């Protein structure tokens, strides 16, 4: 826009384009995403109006909604880098257990507190996990796909990834609780242990039937109700659970039995977000500093 000043272009959103941006008045440095046609919802605006109002220390702030034109604004709170970044530069080493702990801690802060405030994720995934240098981590770009949406791609051909999905998406569940926020975040904890996509699917079958590969075909017996799921198809194989130790070796039990929780089939079995900051895992969680190179 022209009462900010592009510094350059931060790449492409779930919806549009996002630049780095200095408001030329304030001189703060914010994150600006352009969204895409016919008049914009108007229902939408006022969904995202809402979020300005969700505050939190774990929470990407949204600074502002700006609609004018057949375009959306949305100016944020600006971080350096994003942890899909950060463990492709920690490859080699890893990522601390002590970090790697404090940031699910916090993720898990940031997620009672939306979750609390009856707001879901949708989306996440490590490109949308900010942090700075203080060793903090938070959740960026919230994908209410009742605020929005999303069609085939972004909204101009970007293949969507669906490792973070859960399955109850996967299965054609229309209503999504706030559990499938847990099953995308226990996704990207065991990937920052193993230094690998726990569920790298290429497809929407590939991916869940990579997810049923490791954690067995589900049934009516650990998943009541999902054999009457919109895509549940009685010809899925039927695999059988891998040990999981095999998963995220070398996890202690503390935390294989977190993200076990994390990983439950039935949405309603899974852990909360509340619950899982009082497991075990957390006893003798602290908050490092990363070693970030900007
Ligand atoms: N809120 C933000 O700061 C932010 C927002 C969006 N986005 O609105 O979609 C995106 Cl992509 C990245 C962000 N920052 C991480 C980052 C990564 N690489 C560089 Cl060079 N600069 C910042």
């Known amino acids: ?28 440095v914010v994150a600006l995403k352009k969204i895409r046609t016919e008049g ?21 702030k949204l600074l502002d909604v700006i609609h004018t034109e057949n375009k959306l604004y949305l100016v944020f709170e600006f971080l350096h880098q994003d ?22 801690f916090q ?12 707001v879901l994720h949708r989306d996440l995934k490590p490109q949308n996990l900010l942090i700075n240098t203080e060793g903090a981590i938070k959740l960026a770009d919230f994908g209410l796909a009742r605020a929005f949406g999303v069609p085939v791609r972004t909204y101009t051909h970007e293949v969507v990834t669906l490792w973070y ?17 847990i099953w995308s975040l226990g996704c990207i904890f065991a990937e920052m242990v193993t230094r690998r996509a726990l569920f790298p699917g290429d497809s929407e079958i590939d991916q869940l039937f990579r997810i049923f590969r490791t954690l067995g075909t589900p049934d009516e017996v650990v998943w009541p109700g999902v054999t009457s799921m919109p895509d549940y ?5 039927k695999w059988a659970r891998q040990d999981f130790s095999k998963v995220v070796p070398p996890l202690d039990e503390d ?20 619950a899982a900051l009082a497991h075990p895992f957390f006893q003798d ?10």
């Not at 942890?83 to 699910?104: C, E, H, Q, R, V």
């Not at 993720?107 to 009856?118: D, E, I, K, N, V």
């Open 233 to 237: 198809k009685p010809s899925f194989p």
């Open 107 to 118: 993720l898990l802060q940031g997620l009672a507190f939306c979750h609390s405030h009856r």
């Open 165 to 181: 999905r859960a399955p109850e998406i996967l299965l054609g569940c229309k209503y999504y609780s706030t559990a499938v926020d």
């Open 1 to 28: 826009m022209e009462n900010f000043q592009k510094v350059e272009k931060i790449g492409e959103g779930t919806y549009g384009v996002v630049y780095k941006a200095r408001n030329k008045l304030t001189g703060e």
């Open 285 to 294: 969680v602290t908050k490092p500093v990363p070693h970030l190179r900007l």
């Open 40 to 60: 914009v919802p108007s229902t939408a605006i006022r969904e995202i109006s809402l979020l300005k109002e969700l505050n939190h220390p774990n929470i990407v």
């Open 255 to 274: 935390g294989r039995s977190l993200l076990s929780q994390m990983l439950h089939y039935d949405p309603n079995k899974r852990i909360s977000a509340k």
């Open 83 to 104: 942890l899909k970044k950060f463990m492709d530069a920690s490859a080699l080493t890893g990522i601390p257990l002590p970090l790697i702990k404090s940031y699910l």
